[PDB]
């Protein structure tokens, strides 16, 4: 936004949240009447509600950066439920699981998740290792590098950023590391911006 | 602060029709929608600047009305449609009484 009335290059405009307006500090003109509490709005997607009682909790958060655009809902046993239908419907979802070579490469994330928990590594490290891997796995710069060592290299790339200290020898023992190979794969990815 | 169902009951029980309307519209929700006069839907593509209206589907650019209803009502109505129910609103009568 910018004030029509005045218009001096740097627009000195204030958000008077409690009064619910976006105002021009210089002239006094209210530029917007509709204002939302962002923090309280975010609390309808992410909340204390696991029960499903909350009329406020109406949405669900997602990680575009990692999950991409995959919106899905579990078919599960509710209060009244004949197990027959839950099986039938889930059996049906199985036949409809004809996902791509990369929509099946999200199983490489399931590997990193199993490798981080085993390495006693934090959630942020996974979300960094799963990030660096999702960006370098398809790369020509990496080509036919030992696939087992490429994802182990992204675990060190994740650990370096999240300040969680882990030795190359530690990650080397965690999966299986061909020292020269997982040192070369950790450099092509490091070169990949 | 919540001007709820029971508080509503009291304002009715008094007879203050306008104070009720004020509290429900002006003091809260208060929204403006353009409705087609053929189907009772809010499917008008109102281009306020260009003074252009039009509800294609009825191919009507003529029979348009603007209504002042609470936003939550507009929501209810859009929720009813999302579920295949048509809450057709009309500005004319057709019944007597």
């Amino acid at each position: 936004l910018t004030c029509p009335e005045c218009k001096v290059y740097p627009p000195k405009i204030v958000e008077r949240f409690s009064e619910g307006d976006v105002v021009c500090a210089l002239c006094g003109l209210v530029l917007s009447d509709k204002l939302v509490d962002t923090r309280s709005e975010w609390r309808t997607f992410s909340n204390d509600d696991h029960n499903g009682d909350d009329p406020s909790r109406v949405g669900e958060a997602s990680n575009p950066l990692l999950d991409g655009n995959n919106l899905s809902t579990r078919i599960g046993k509710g209060e009244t439920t004949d197990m027959r239908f839950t099986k039938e419907l889930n059996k049906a979802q199985g036949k409809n699981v004809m996902d791509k070579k990369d929509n099946e490469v999200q199983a490489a994330f399931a590997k990193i998740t199993m490798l981080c928990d085993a390495a006693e590594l934090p959630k942020i490290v996974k979300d960094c290792a799963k990030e660096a891997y999702k960006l370098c796995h398809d790369e020509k710069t990496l080509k036919g590098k030992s696939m087992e060592s490429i994802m182990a290299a992204s675990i060190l790339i994740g650990c370096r950023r999240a300040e969680v200290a882990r030795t190359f020898k530690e990650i080397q023992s965690l999966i299986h590391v061909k020292t020269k190979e997982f040192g070369k794969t950790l450099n092509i990815m490091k070169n990949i911006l | 602060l919540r001007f709820g169902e029971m508080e509503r009951d009291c304002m009715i029980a008094h007879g203050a029709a306008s104070f009720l309307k004020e509290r429900l519209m002006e003091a809260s929700d208060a929204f403006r929608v353009h409705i087609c006069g053929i189907c009772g839907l809010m499917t008008v593509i109102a281009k306020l600047n260009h003074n252009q209206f039009e509800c294609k589907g009825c191919d009507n650019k003529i029979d348009i009305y603007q209504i002042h209803i609470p936003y939550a009502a507009k929501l209810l109505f859009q929720e009813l449609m999302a579920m295949n129910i048509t809450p057709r609103l009309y500005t004319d009568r057709s019944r007597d009484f």
């Binding site: - | 029971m6 009951d9 009291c10 009715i12 029980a13 008094h14 007879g15 009484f97």
Partner: protein, 269 residues
């Protein structure tokens, strides 16, 4: 449930009580066509006491030396004795009073005299005295004709329902029945002259106020009547602090119209 049930019920411009469909619930609000905020518990008299006492209080026999109005009561008193033409007005007056007595005893079987009605006639009379400085020792300027017919005329002016048709006029007459019983009992010839000792100026004013006050008491079309009834039953149910099932748990049975009810009994007379 009471609110949501009685929600749409309101008084209409024809003194009727209908819902959002125009379906008649009551034909005239609260049977009488009155706003409850303008009602007061008032003594019906005529209903109670011995027949002997009633004949003392109300009977006026201008044709009998002892049962005539003593000339201490009115100027007219000396020339009123044995007035055949006038006695017909009083015979009719008293007739109506006994008609009222048999009637009220049919309405309130047990003989309860204190019923809420509009217009506090007692206080109007009190105020007429307090104002005109009524001399409790001097004979009134009022004529039998002044009283008899004035009270007759006031009855005609106490309208709840205006409507030229017969149905409406009967409806109007029926709604004023009980109140007119009170009016007649209170404004009887003997009572006015003996008990109240009112002047013509005083009595005319007394009538004038009865009219304006009565009219003021009548319901206002628009009265949210239904929500009112619901809140008026609802609120005191909240105040209920708990071998027949009683209070809140029994009110529950009633509103649900529960077929399997807790304490079923029958009072065999």
């Amino acid at each position: 449930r009471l609110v949501k049930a009685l929600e749409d019920i309101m008084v209409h411009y024809d003194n009727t009580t209908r819902n959002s469909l125009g379906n008649v619930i009551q034909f005239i609000y609260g049977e009488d066509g009155m706003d409850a905020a303008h009602i007061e518990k008032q003594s019906l008299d005529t209903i109670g006491g011995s027949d002997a006492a009633f004949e003392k209080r109300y009977r006026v026999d201008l044709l009998n030396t002892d049962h005539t109005l003593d000339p201490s009561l009115l100027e007219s008193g000396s020339e009123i004795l044995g007035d055949l033409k006038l006695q017909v007005l009083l015979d009719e007056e008293y007739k109506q009073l006994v008609k009222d007595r048999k009637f009220l005893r049919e309405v309130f079987v047990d003989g309860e005299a204190n019923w809420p009605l509009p217009v506090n006639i007692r206080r109007i009379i009190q105020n007429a005295q307090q104002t005109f400085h009524i001399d409790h020792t001097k004979p009134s300027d009022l004529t039998i004709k002044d009283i008899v017919l004035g009270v007759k005329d006031l009855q005609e002016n106490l309208l709840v329902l205006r409507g030229k048709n017969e149905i409406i006029q009967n409806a109007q007459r029926d709604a004023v029945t009980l109140f007119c019983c009170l009016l007649r009992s209170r404004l009887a010839t003997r009572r006015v002259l003996q008990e109240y000792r009112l002047t013509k100026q005083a009595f005319d004013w007394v009538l004038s106020n009865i009219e304006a006050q009565f009219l003021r008491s009548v319901v206002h079309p628009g009265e949210m009547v239904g929500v009112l009834a619901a809140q008026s039953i609802g609120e005191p149910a909240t105040q209920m602090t708990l071998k027949v099932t009683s209070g809140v748990p029994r009110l529950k049975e009633i509103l649900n119209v529960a077929k399997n009810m807790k304490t079923p009994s029958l009072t065999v007379y």
